[PDB]
Amino acid sequence: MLKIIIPTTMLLPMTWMSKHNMIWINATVHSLLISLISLSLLNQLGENSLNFSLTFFSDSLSAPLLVLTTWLLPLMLMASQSHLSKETTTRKKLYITMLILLQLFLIMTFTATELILFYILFEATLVPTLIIITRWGNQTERLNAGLYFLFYTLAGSLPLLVALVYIQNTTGSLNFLIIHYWSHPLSNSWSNIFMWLACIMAFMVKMPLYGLHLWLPKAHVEAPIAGSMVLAAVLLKLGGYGMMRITTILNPLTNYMAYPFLMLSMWGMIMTSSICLRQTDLKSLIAYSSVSHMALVIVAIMIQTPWSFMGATALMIAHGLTSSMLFCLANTNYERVHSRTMILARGLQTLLPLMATWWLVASLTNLALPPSINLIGELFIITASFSWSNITIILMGMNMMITALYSLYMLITTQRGKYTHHINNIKPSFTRENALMALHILPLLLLTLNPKMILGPLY
Amino acid sequence: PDSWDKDVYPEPPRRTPAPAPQTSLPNPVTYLTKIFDLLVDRPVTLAREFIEQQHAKNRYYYYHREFRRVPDITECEEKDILCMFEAEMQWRRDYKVDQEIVNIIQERLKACQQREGESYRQNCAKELEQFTQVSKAFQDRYSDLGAHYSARKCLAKQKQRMLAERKAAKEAAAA
Amino acid sequence: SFPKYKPSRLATLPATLDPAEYDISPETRKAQAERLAIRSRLKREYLLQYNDPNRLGVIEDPALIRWTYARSANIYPNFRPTPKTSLLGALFGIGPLFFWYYVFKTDRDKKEKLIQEGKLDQTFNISY
Amino acid sequence: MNPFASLTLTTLTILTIPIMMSNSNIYKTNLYPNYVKTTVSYAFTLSLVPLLMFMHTGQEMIISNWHWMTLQTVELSLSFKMDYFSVMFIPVALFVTWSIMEFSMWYMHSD
Amino acid sequence: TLCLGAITTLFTALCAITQNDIKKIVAFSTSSQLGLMMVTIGINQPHLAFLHICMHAFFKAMLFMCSGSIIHSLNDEQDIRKMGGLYKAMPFTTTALIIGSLALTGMPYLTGFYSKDLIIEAVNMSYTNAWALLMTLIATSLTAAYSTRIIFFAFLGKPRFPPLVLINENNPLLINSIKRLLIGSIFAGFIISNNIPPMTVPNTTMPLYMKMTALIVTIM
Amino acid sequence: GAHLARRYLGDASKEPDPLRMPTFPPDYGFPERKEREMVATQQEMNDAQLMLQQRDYCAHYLIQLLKCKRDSFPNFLACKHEQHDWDYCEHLDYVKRMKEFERERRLLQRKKRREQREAEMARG
Amino acid sequence: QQERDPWYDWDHPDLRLNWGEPIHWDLDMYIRNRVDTSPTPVSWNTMCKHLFGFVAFMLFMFWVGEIYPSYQPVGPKQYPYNDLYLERGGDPTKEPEPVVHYEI
Amino acid sequence: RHSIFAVTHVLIPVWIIHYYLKYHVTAKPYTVVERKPRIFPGDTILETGEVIPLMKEFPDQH
Amino acid sequence: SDAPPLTLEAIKDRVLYVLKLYDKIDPEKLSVNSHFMKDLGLDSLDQVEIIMAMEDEFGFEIPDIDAEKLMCPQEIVDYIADKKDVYE
Amino acid sequence: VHIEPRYRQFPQLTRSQLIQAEFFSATMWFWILWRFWHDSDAVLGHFPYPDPSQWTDEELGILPDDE
Amino acid sequence: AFSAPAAYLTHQQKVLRLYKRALRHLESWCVHRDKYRYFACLMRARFDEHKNEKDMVKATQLLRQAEEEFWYGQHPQPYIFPESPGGTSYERYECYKVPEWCLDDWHPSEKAMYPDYFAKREQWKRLRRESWEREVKQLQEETPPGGPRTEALPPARKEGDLPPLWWHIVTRPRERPM
Ligand SMILES: CCCCCCCCCCCCCCCCC[C@@H](O)O[C@H](CO[C@H](O)CCCCCCCCCCCCCCC)COP(=O)(O)OCC[N+](C)(C)C
Ligand SMILES: CCCCCCCC/C=C/CCCCCCCC(=O)OC[C@H](COP(=O)(O)OCCN)OC(=O)CCCCCCC/C=C/CCCCCCCC
Ligand SMILES: CCCCCCCC/C=C\CCCCCCCC(=O)O[C@H](COC(=O)CCCCCCC/C=C/CCCCCCCC)COP(=O)(O)OCCN
Numbered sequence A: 001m002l003k004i005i006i007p008t009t010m011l012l013p014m015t016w017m018s019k020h021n022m023i024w025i026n027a028t029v030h031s032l033l034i035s036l037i038s039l040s041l042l043n044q045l046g047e048n049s050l051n052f053s054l055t056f057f058s059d060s061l062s063a064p065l066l067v068l069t070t071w072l073l074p075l076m077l078m079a080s081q082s083h084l085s086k087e088t089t090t091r092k093k094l095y096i097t098m099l100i101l102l103q104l105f106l107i108m109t110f111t112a113t114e115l116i117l118f119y120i121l122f123e124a125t126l127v128p129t130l131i132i133i134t135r136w137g138n139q140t141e142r143l144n145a146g147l148y149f150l151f152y153t154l155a156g157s158l159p160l161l162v163a164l165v166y167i168q169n170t171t172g173s174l175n176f177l178i179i180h181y182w183s184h185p186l187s188n189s190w191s192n193i194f195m196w197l198a199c200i201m202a203f204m205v206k207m208p209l210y211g212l213h214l215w216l217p218k219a220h221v222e223a224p225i226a227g228s229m230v231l232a233a234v235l236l237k238l239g240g241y242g243m244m245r246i247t248t249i250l251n252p253l254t255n256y257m258a259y260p261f262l263m264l265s266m267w268g269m270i271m272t273s274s275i276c277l278r279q280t281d282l283k284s285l286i287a288y289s290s291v292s293h294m295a296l297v298i299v300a301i302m303i304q305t306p307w308s309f310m311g312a313t314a315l316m317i318a319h320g321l322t323s324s325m326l327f328c329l330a331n332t333n334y335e336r337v338h339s340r341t342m343i344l345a346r347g348l349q350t351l352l353p354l355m356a357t358w359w360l361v362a363s364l365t366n367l368a369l370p371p372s373i374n375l376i377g378e379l380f381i382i383t384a385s386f387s388w389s390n391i392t393i394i395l396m397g398m399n400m401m402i403t404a405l406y407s408l409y410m411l412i413t414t415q416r417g418k419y420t421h422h423i424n425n426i427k428p429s430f431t432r433e434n435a436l437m438a439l440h441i442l443p444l445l446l447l448t449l450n451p452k453m454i455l456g457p458l459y
Numbered sequence B: 001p002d003s004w005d006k007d008v009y010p011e012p013p014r015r016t017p018a019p020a021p022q023t024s025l026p027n028p029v030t031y032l033t034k035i036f037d038l039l040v041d042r043p044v045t046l047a048r049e050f051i052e053q054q055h056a057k058n059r060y061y062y063y064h065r066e067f068r069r070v071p072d073i074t075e076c077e078e079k080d081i082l083c084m085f086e087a088e089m090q091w092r093r094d095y096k097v098d099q100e101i102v103n104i105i106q107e108r109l110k111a112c113q114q115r116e117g118e119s120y121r122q123n124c125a126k127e128l129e130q131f132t133q134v135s136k137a138f139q140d141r142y143s144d145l146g147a148h149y150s151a152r153k154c155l156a157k158q159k160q161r162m163l164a165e166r167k168a169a170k171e172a173a174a175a
Numbered sequence C: 001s002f003p004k005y006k007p008s009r010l011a012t013l014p015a016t017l018d019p020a021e022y023d024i025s026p027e028t029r030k031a032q033a034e035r036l037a038i039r040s041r042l043k044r045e046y047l048l049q050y051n052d053p054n055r056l057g058v059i060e061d062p063a064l065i066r067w068t069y070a071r072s073a074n075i076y077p078n079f080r081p082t083p084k085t086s087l088l089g090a091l092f093g094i095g096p097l098f099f100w101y102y103v104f105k106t107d108r109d110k111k112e113k114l115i116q117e118g119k120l121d122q123t124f125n126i127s128y
Numbered sequence D: 001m002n003p004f005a006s007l008t009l010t011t012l013t014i015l016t017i018p019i020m021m022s023n024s025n026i027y028k029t030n031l032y033p034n035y036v037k038t039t040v041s042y043a044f045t046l047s048l049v050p051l052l053m054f055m056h057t058g059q060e061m062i063i064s065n066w067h068w069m070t071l072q073t074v075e076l077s078l079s080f081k082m083d084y085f086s087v088m089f090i091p092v093a094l095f096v097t098w099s100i101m102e103f104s105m106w107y108m109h110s111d
Numbered sequence E: 001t002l003c004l005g006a007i008t009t010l011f012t013a014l015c016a017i018t019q020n021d022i023k024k025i026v027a028f029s030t031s032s033q034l035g036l037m038m039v040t041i042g043i044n045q046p047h048l049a050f051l052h053i054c055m056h057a058f059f060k061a062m063l064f065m066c067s068g069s070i071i072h073s074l075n076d077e078q079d080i081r082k083m084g085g086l087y088k089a090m091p092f093t094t095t096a097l098i099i100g101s102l103a104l105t106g107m108p109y110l111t112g113f114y115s116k117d118l119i120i121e122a123v124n125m126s127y128t129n130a131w132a133l134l135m136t137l138i139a140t141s142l143t144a145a146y147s148t149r150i151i152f153f154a155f156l157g158k159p160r161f162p163p164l165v166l167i168n169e170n171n172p173l174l175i176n177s178i179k180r181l182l183i184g185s186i187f188a189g190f191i192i193s194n195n196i197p198p199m200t201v202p203n204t205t206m207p208l209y210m211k212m213t214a215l216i217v218t219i220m
Numbered sequence F: 001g002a003h004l005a006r007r008y009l010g011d012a013s014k015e016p017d018p019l020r021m022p023t024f025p026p027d028y029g030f031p032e033r034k035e036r037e038m039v040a041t042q043q044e045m046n047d048a049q050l051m052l053q054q055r056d057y058c059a060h061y062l063i064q065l066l067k068c069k070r071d072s073f074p075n076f077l078a079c080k081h082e083q084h085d086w087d088y089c090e091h092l093d094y095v096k097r098m099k100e101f102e103r104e105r106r107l108l109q110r111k112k113r114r115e116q117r118e119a120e121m122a123r124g
Numbered sequence G: 001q002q003e004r005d006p007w008y009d010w011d012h013p014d015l016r017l018n019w020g021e022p023i024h025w026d027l028d029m030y031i032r033n034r035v036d037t038s039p040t041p042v043s044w045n046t047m048c049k050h051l052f053g054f055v056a057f058m059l060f061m062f063w064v065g066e067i068y069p070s071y072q073p074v075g076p077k078q079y080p081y082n083d084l085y086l087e088r089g090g091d092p093t094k095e096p097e098p099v100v101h102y103e104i
Numbered sequence H: 001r002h003s004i005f006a007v008t009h010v011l012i013p014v015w016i017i018h019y020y021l022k023y024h025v026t027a028k029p030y031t032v033v034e035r036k037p038r039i040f041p042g043d044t045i046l047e048t049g050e051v052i053p054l055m056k057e058f059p060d061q062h
Numbered sequence I: 001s002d003a004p005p006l007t008l009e010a011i012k013d014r015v016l017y018v019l020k021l022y023d024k025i026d027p028e029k030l031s032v033n034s035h036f037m038k039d040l041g042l043d044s045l046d047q048v049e050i051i052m053a054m055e056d057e058f059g060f061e062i063p064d065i066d067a068e069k070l071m072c073p074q075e076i077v078d079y080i081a082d083k084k085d086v087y088e
Numbered sequence J: 001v002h003i004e005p006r007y008r009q010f011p012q013l014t015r016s017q018l019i020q021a022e023f024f025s026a027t028m029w030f031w032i033l034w035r036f037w038h039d040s041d042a043v044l045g046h047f048p049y050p051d052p053s054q055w056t057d058e059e060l061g062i063l064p065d066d067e
Numbered sequence K: 001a002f003s004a005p006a007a008y009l010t011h012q013q014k015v016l017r018l019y020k021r022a023l024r025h026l027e028s029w030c031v032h033r034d035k036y037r038y039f040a041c042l043m044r045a046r047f048d049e050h051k052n053e054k055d056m057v058k059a060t061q062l063l064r065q066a067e068e069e070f071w072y073g074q075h076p077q078p079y080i081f082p083e084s085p086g087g088t089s090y091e092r093y094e095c096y097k098v099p100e101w102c103l104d105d106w107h108p109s110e111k112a113m114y115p116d117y118f119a120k121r122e123q124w125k126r127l128r129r130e131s132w133e134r135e136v137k138q139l140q141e142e143t144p145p146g147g148p149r150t151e152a153l154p155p156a157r158k159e160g161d162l163p164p165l166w167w168h169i170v171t172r173p174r175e176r177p178m
C-alpha cells in the first residue's frame, strides 16, 4: 500500500520546492491524482482483508475511509486558497505541509494492522490539527478551542495506551488478525469493567459522546475552513473505526456495559438536535448536527449487529461528505459578510441562485432524504435498534423530525425571505466555490448509485 | 429461456384460454398489439439479431471457480492458526452460499404469490413450507452470532443446542 | 355589558383593551417623548451611513453583537450555583437518562425472559 | 412480447425527458411549458393502452428490472407493481396533470 | 381507521361552512372527502375507496381550476365576500362550478354518484360504529351545505368587487382544460364503473328509506 | 333499525345476538332440513380467481358474468342478464339470511315464553 | 415580532426590527415564522375548554358507539366448503369439523 | 418536422425499454412475473388444447 | 394579460368621480385643489369615510397614519400615484 | 380576442363562451335524464325488501309452543 | 408608512381609528352593500351622538367602553385587502425585488446590452456623489445639539440642493419588479 503512502511524502518536497505562484495548482493536481490512485482499494474481497504486508492491510471498512481522506485533501486546498491570499509564501507552504502531514497520518492510521501503531498515528493526528486551529484561526477563542480539543482527546486516550500494553502483555500480540482469531470472552469482573472502560472511552471522546462533546463546538467553530472540514469529515470517524475494531475483544461484557452509553447516545441525540433549533451561529448549528449523527453511529456500534455495522459505515461516510459541504457553504457567506450570525445576511436566494440550490441539496441530504446514503445508514441503524428494542422507535422518530426541522429552518433563514438592505458587498459566486460544492455533492449521488462500496465488511 | 435452470426456478404450465369473442365489434387491444409489434418488436428483434451475430464472431468463455473441501473448525487444534484460517474462510464461504439459498427460496415464494393471484393463500402452501423449513434451519445455524461472528461462535452455539437437546432427550427417555 | 377578555402568555392583551393607555399623566407623556427621541437618533445614525455612497460592506449593529454575545459567551461568567439551578440541572440532566434506562432495561428483560422460556414468535427473524 | 410491460415502463420513463432537457436550449425559451404539457399529454395517451389491456383480460404484472443491493438474505431491487390500482390511477393522474398544466400556461403567464 | 375518518370528515365539513376564502373552502372539502375515503377503508371496502379517489380527482381538480379562474379575473381576490354576480359575467366558469358542485354532492348518475352513494350504502349496511355512521351522515349533509355556500356567495346576488371590471375568461387554454375536466366529471364514473370487474359483493337488498339516505341528507 | 332500538332499549336477552348466532340447533323446529346446494366446484372458483369473499353459494352466476364481460370486451354494456342474475342470487341469499335472523329471534321469543310459563307452573 | 406594527417603516421589514434597538433574548423564538403571542378574538382558557370538550366528547361518543354497534337484521354469511377451509389457509390433512348450512 | 416529437420522445424510448426488457431483464428468472390468466368453464387452453367442462346444470331459477 | 398600466389621468378622473358621487359635496364646487375641511366644510368622520371610499375603489388600503393627512383630491391622487409607481 | 375594461358596466361577453356553457349544461341535464330513464333502479332500488313480521311460523320452522 | 410617527396618538386620532376599524368589521359582517350602508349610517349616528361632549374624562371612558364592545363583536375573519399586512398577497413580490447596486456586479458583456440604461445609471451615480456632502451638511445644520426629537426629515432649501437622505427612497425596486 506504499503506492499511496509514498506519493504524499512526495507531495511534501514538491510543495516546498514549487515556485511562489504555483503551490496551489501543483498541490491540487497531485492530490487529485493520489485520490484516483487510492480509488483502487475499493476492489475488496468477500471473506478476508487485503494483507499487503506485515504492517499494513485493508478491508472494506477502511477502504471507503481512505478514499474519503484522499478526496477531502483537494477540497481543503481549494477552500483554503481563498482566505490565505495575503499570507507569505513560507507560511502558505507551512499550511499545505500541515494538511499533507494530516492526510499521511490518517492514511497510515486507517490501515495499521496492530493496535499500538494505530494508537501512535491516531494520536499523531492531533499535532497538525492543533497547529492549524491555533495558528490560522481567526478569533481569540482559537486558543481555548485548541486546549479543549487536545486535553479532551488525551484524557481519554492515555488509559487506552495503558490498556493496550496490558492486553499485549497478557495475550502476547496486538495484531488485529491474531486478536480476532484468538479472541476469548471477557469475564464479569471489576478489572474487566475498567479494561472495557479504558478501551472504549478514547473512541467515545473522539465521536464525541454526549456529555464529552463540549470540545467539538469550540474546535469546529474557531477553526479555519480546512480545519473544520478535516475535523467533521474524517477525524470524527477515527472513533468509529477504533470502536468497531476493538469491540471484538470486549464481548460479552458489552451486552451490559453499553447500557449507560446507549442512553447517553439516545437521549443526547434529542438534546443536541434541539440545540440546533435555537442556534444563532451557523457553524455551531452544523457542529451540533454532527454530534447528533455521531450519537446515532455510537448506538449502531454499541448494539453490535451486522445491520447496525453496515448502517454505521454508511452513516459515517455520508455524514463526512454532508458536513464538509455544509461547512464550506457557510464559509462562503462568512467570507461575504465576515460574520457568523445566521440572521445577518438573509434572502440570499435572490442574489446567489446557484449557491441557493447548493444549499438546498446539502440540506436535503442532511435530513436523510431517500435514496441517499444518509438515509440508508440511518434506516439500517433504526431497524437494528428496533430489533434491539421496539421502544427505540420513539426516540429515533423524534430525532428524524427535529433534524428535518432544523435543517429546513437553517435553509429558510439563510436563503429565503428578503435581503438585508445595507449589505451591498455580496459579489457573484466564483467558479472556485461552485466547483467545490459540485465536487462535494456529486460523489454523494454517485455513491447512492452503488452503495455496497460503503456498507462495510458485514455486507 | 434456457439462460437459467428450470429445476431450481420451477414454473407452472401457463395454460392460457383461447379468445372466443361473443361480439362482432373490433377489438382495440388486438389492433394495438399488431401496431406495437410491427413498429417496435421488429426493429428491436433486428437490432438484437445483428448484435448476436456480432457476438458470434468473437466467442470466448469464462469459468466457475472450484474450491476444495479443507478441514473445518472441528479438526483444528486450539492454537493452530493455519488450520483455523482455512476453516474460517471455508465457513464464511458456506455462510454466503446459505444466504444465497435462502434468497432463492424467497424468490420462489414471491413469484408464487404474484402468479397465483387471489388463490395465493392456498396455492402457495408448498413454497411457504419450504421457506419455513429453510428459514428455521438458517436461524438455527447463524442467528444471534452478531457482528464479529466466526466459525468458533457458530460451533459453540451448535454445541450448546446439542447439549440442551441431549438433556431433553435423556429426560424424556427417563419416563 | 359583554364578557371580558382574559389575556395569557401565548395570547396577549390588545393595546386598545389596556387601561394603561386611557390614563395618561405628563410623566408618561415625557417618557414617550424621550423614547421617540432615542428611536429617532438611532434611526438617524443608521440612515447617515446607510445612504453613504462611499460605504461598502456590512453596517455593524452593536445590538446584534450584544445579543449574540449575551446568548453565547456571557452565560457562564454570570452563572451561580443555587438550589434552583442545582435542582434543575440534576433533574433535566439525569432524570431522562434514568427514566429511559429503566424503560429499556425492563423491556429487554421481558424480551429475554420470554426468549429463554420459549415463545416470542421468532419465525422468519433472519435479519438482526 | 407482451406490450404491457414495455408500455407501462415507457409511460413512466418519457416523463423524465423534459427533466433531462432542463439544461438544454429549451429551458431558457418560452416554449418549455408547451413542451412539458405535450409530454404529459403523450404520456396519458400512451398509458391509456395498458388500461385497455387490463379492462380486456385483467392483466397484472410485477417488473423487477434492476437489482440494487442484497444485504444478506434481503434483496432490494427496482420493482414496479402494475396491478389494477396502478394501471387505473396513472391515466387519471396524467389527465388531471395535463389539464392543470394547460391551465397554468394561462394562470402563471406573467411569472 | 373508521373512527379517524369519521371524525376527520365531520370536523372539516363543519369548519368549511363558515370560511370566507374560496380556496380554504375547497381545501376543507378535500379533507372531508379524504375522511370519507378513510371511512370506506375502515369498513373493509378498499376498492370502493380507490374508485372514490379516481372519481374525486376529476371534480375536485376542476373546482380548484374554476376558483383560480375567478381569482385571476377579479384582480387576485379570493374572499367570497367580494365576489358578486358572476353567474352571468362568467358563464363557462359558473356552469363548470355548478356541475362540479353537483358531482361532489352525489347527484345521481354523475362521477361522484357512482362512488359516494355506494360508499354511503355500504356504510349503512355494515357492522360498524354508530357514532361513525352518524358523523358520516352529518358530513354528507354539510358537504351540500358548503357547496351551497360557495355557489350562493360567489355567483348569485349583486357585484361586490371593485368598479374596474377586468372579467375576461375568453382564452382557449383555460376553456379547453376546464372542458376536458368537465367531460370527465360528467362521463368518467359511468365509463369506469361499467368496465372494471366486480371486486366486491353488492348491496342488492336494502330498505327503501335507506337506499335514499344520501339523497335525503343532501337535500336537507 | 327498529331491531337495534328493541335490543339496546328493551330486553336484550329477548333479541338475537348478531355475533353469537345461531343459538338453537338447525333442526330444533324443522322436521326436515335440506342441505344447501353449491353449483360451482372448488377448482372452478380457484381457476376463476374470484375472491375469498365472492366464493359463496352464488359464485356460479359471478363466474358466468365474468366470462361474459371478458368475452364481449369492447361492448361493455352487453352483460346485463348475467349481472341481473348474479344480483338476484345475492338478493335471495340476503333474504335467507334475514329469514335466519327472524327465525332465531322468534325462537328466543318462544324459549323465553316457555321458560316463564314453566316457572309460573312451578309457583304452584 | 408579529405583534409589531406592520405599517411602520422598519429597517428590517420582514424581521420588524430597527438598527440599534435592544433585541429580545428570545428573538429567534419570536421571528414570526415561529411562536406567535398576538391577541386572539376568543380568550385563552376558553379556546382550550372548547377544544378539550370537543375532543373528549368525540372520544366518549366513539366508545359508546363501539359498545352499542349498529348492524342489520341478518344472520352470518355462509360459505360452501366448510367455510372455505381449504382456501382460507389450507391444512389439507385434517378433515376439520363439518360446517353445513341448510335451506331456509 | 411535422411529427418529430413522437419519434424522438416515444418511439426511441419504447425501443430502448423494449430491448432492455426483452433481452436483459427477462434473461434472468422471476424478474418479470405475470398474474396467471383467468380460466372459466368452457374455454380451451391454447397449448394443451383441452376443454374445461361446463359448470354443472344451473337450476335456472329466474 | 393583467390590468392595463394605470396612469395619472385615470387616477385623477376616478378620485374626482368618487368624490362627485358623495352627497355631502357639491359637484360644481369641488375642484382638485379643494381642501376638504375649508373649501367643503366637512369634519373628521367625513374625511375618514372618503378615505375608505377611495380604498374600496382602488383596491388597496391606506394606513391611518398616512390617510389622516390627505385633505385634497390632489393629495390623494399623488399618494396613489406614488404607491403604484405611476410616473406618467 | 381583445376585450376592454368597462368601469362599472357589465363586462363584454362573447357568443362562443355563452354557447359553450349552454351546451355543456344541456349535456349534463340530458345525460342525467337519459340515465335515470334507463337505469332508474340504481336510485330507486330493484329487488323488493321483504317484511320479516309477515313470514309464517311454518316456513321459519317453529312448532306451536308444544315442547 | 411614509409618515414619521409621533410619540403618542391624540384622543381624536384614537376615535378616528376606532371608527375606521368598526366600519371595516361591520362591512365584514354585512356582506351586502345595502345592508352595510344601513348599518354604517346607524354607526355614524352613534358616533355623532357624543361628538359634542366637552368632558374629556367621560369621553375617554366612553371610548374605553367602545373598545371593549368592538373586541367582543369583532369579526373573527375580517376582510383583508390582498396586499395588506394580513392579505393573501402581502409579500408575494418580495422575491422579485433586487437592489440596484447588484447592477454594479454585472459582467461587461452583460452591460454591453442596455448601453443607454447604464449611461443614465452613471448620470444618477454622479448626481448622488455630488449631492451627498451638501446633504450631510444640511442635516448637520438643522438638528439640535441633543439629537433629533423626531424622525421627520427636512427638504432641500436651495435651488441646486437635493432632499437629504433621498437615494434609497428614490431608487426603490418597484411594486411589481418582475
Ligand atoms: C459525561 C458522560 C461521561 C461518560 C459516562 C460513562 C459511564 C460509566 C459507568 C459504567 C456503568 C457500569 C459500572 C459498574 C458496573 C455495575 C453497576 C453497579 O451498579 O454495580 C452493581 C453493584 O452494586 C454497587 O453499585 C457496586 C458499585 C458501587 C460504587 C459505584 C458508584 C459510582 C457512582 C457513579 C459515578 C459517575 C461516573 C463518572 C465518574 C467521574 C451491580 O451489582 P453486582 O451484580 O453485584 O456487580 C456486577 C459487577 N461485578 C460482577 C464485577 C461485581
Ligand atoms: C408522533 C411523535 C410526535 C408527536 C407530535 C408531538 C409534538 C411535537 C412537538 C412540535 C415541535 C415544534 C417546535 C418546532 C416548530 C417550529 C415552529 C413553527 O413551526 O411555528 C409554528 C407554525 C406557525 O403556525 P401557523 O398557524 O401556521 O401561523 C401562521 C400565521 N402566523 O405552525 C406549526 O408548524 C405548528 C405545528 C406544531 C404541531 C404540534 C401539534 C401536533 C400534535 C399531534 C397529535 C395528534 C396525533 C395524530 C393521531 C393520529 C391517529 C393515529
Ligand atoms: C474526557 C474524559 C475521559 C476520561 C476517561 C478516563 C477514565 C477511563 C476509565 C478508567 C481507565 C483506567 C483503567 C486502567 C487500565 C486498564 C488495565 C486493566 O484493566 O487491568 C486491570 C487493572 O484494573 C485496574 O487496576 C483499574 C484501576 C483504576 C484506577 C484509575 C482510576 C481512574 C478513575 C476511575 C473512575 C472513573 C472511570 C470512568 C470515568 C468516565 C469519564 C467520565 C487488571 O489488572 P490486575 O491488577 O492484574 O488484576 C487482575 C489480577 N488480580
Ligand SMILES: *OP(=O)(O)OCC(C)(C)[C@@H](O)C(=O)NCCC(=O)NCCSC(=O)CCCCCCCCCCC
Binding pocket: I043, I044, I045, K011, K012, K015, K022, K025, K026, K029, K046, K047, K050, K051, K052, K053, K059, K060, K062, K063, K066, K067, K069, K070, K073, K074, K075
Ligand atoms: O376632529 P373631528 O373629525 O371633528 O372628530 C370629532 C371628535 C369625535 C374627535 C370630537 O368631537 C371629540 O373629541 N369628541 C369627544 C367625545 C368622543 O368622541 N368619545 C368617543 C365616542 S365612542 C362611541 O360611543 C362609539 C360607539 C360605537 C363603538 C363601537 C362598538 C361596535 C363595534 C362592533 C363592530 C362590529
